[PDB]
Write a protein that binds this ligand. Sequence first.
Ligand SMILES: O=C(Nc1ccccc1NS(=O)(=O)c1ccc(F)cc1)[C@@H](O)c1cccnc1
Ligand SMILES: O=C(Nc1ccccc1NS(=O)(=O)c1ccc(F)cc1)[C@@H](O)c1cccnc1
Ligand SMILES: [Cl-]
Ligand SMILES: [Cl-]
Lengths: 304, 304
Amino acid sequence: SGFRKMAFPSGKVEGCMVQVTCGTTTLNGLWLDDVVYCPRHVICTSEDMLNPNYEDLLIRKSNHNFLVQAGNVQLRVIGHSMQNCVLKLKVDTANPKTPKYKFVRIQPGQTFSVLACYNGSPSGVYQCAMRPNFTIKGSFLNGSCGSVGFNIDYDCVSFCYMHHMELPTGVHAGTDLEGNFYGPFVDRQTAQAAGTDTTITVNVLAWLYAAVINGDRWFLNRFTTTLNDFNLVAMKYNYEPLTQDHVDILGPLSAQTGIAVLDMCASLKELLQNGMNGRTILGSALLEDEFTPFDVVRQCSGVT
Amino acid sequence: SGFRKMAFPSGKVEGCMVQVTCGTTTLNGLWLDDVVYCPRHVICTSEDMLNPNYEDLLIRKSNHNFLVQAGNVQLRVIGHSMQNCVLKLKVDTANPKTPKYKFVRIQPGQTFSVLACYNGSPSGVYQCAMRPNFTIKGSFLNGSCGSVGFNIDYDCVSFCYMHHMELPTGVHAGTDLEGNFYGPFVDRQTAQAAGTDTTITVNVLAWLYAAVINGDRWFLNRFTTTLNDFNLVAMKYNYEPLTQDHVDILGPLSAQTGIAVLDMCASLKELLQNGMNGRTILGSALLEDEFTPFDVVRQCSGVT
Ligand SMILES: O=C(Nc1ccccc1NS(=O)(=O)c1ccc(F)cc1)[C@@H](O)c1cccnc1
Ligand SMILES: O=C(Nc1ccccc1NS(=O)(=O)c1ccc(F)cc1)[C@@H](O)c1cccnc1
Ligand SMILES: [Cl-]
Ligand SMILES: [Cl-]
């Protein structure tokens, strides 16, 4: 028993973290095979960030201007290119620590682990969710750009996120490993604001299932509801609309607990309408939405 | 910016996780040099756990009865011994992945990362605090015993905890790496209950400092207080008594924010006496105490 915001073991990703320097800008890069992936704003100074024309800026740069360092050893850059908002530095040595990997573009509501890095060195690992507004609520400082988000399927690392920027509002924006930003964000020093941060309803429900599995069932009531009625309540509280796909995905949790999804929805509806009244669920005084139904099942079954 | 319950990168500890089987009991072991450390209840069946005489139980066991497996390779056990509540299995091969390590017995209130494991395979990593009642609020299932807690100082892993048991109340008990349990817990299937779970006041204060650093200062008031007056309030709310040592340890945080410790204490006093009134601090609706002043400083400065 017990329920924690649990990140994947980060060792396979630590083996890929390198330091990339271009001019006076130092950030993190991901070394997989003979390619180092990093944010393209490595070629900019804080002056260039106001309005950067990256194609023109990249042209004033050559292979020898990109300093890649894996630990204390210097990598030889034999090629460079811009794929959307990431630079791909071809090095002459394949990473001996490259794990089985994939680049996947995750959907909003899905979760992933972040290995926060500075100067190509890992400092910490935490669990995150891609918000419905395509931002993440991470912990990133200056020098953290190039820190990656990932998932692990037994021995295959699915790289899903690369850190690029913090918005003036304190939330984080970044790209997938092909350089495409999640959301409408651009890698420019300009006024950019995130949309409404809605709550991932299916995840809150999965976490109510985890709470019940873990002995916390004070919030369970004698009522039920319908998808349309529950969604009328969800809409008002800025919660994501719950679909039949979400009900289906909650099936394994519903089966293990013996609680129908619409019954759990009625409990959620009363928690929204009445609050927690000073009580906690899984040691939390608010409704947690950064655990997918897959995360709950994995944690409550010991998936290694 | 951003503030997360951030665990240490777990790679150095993944390289040490092995599977230990004795009879039909399978748990995790820590392989450092030519020694595998694991909980001694590996020699018990669920029948023995009612009242185990471990010396007598260990005597009916020989080196060949301890099956150690590092990944898919079998380790040869050439010696075995009982140190308090841990078995130390001498193997014929030193772990090539042994990092610089120490065994440290942490103090209540201090934090550490746990690499939860099943069958010698890591499944997740999360941050924890040793509660003032010597329990931990972890996420551990059957098969997780032998999962370790650690801290990292640049390249040295300080192993501080080994998981042994879950109490009937859902919290977790375990030992340091010398086999000594934290608290009054014994490795026996008997009625054991934890004491009062008090709140780590210095950690709540460090987290209020992190909140302020990260732009959240709604809770900051025009009042101050004294150590004795603040402690009168802390006592009633089952908060740990705040000492001058705690004030000193909060010095670096107090200096960076320009907020005196006793001023932060007065804000804490009003948060205890009045509640959060539906507001959040660092996305949390309760006072977080699982971040030491060192954790806040490290996270807010990027210690790798
Ligand atoms: O976004 C950051 N800073 C920042 C905050 C707010 C406005 C502007 C900047 N920096 S900037 O204009 O140079 C820039 C813009 C877009 C981009 F993709 C990278 C850099 C960046 O230094 C950072 C720090 C902390 C955690 N993550 C990222
Ligand atoms: O403590 C556990 N189970 C349990 C729960 C409650 C009462 C008894 C037992 N198990 S027992 O009597 O066999 C035992 C007792 C002491 C001990 F150190 C190891 C095993 C153990 O299987 C476990 C599971 C889940 C997460 N951590 C540990
Ligand atoms: Cl820059
Ligand atoms: Cl057992």
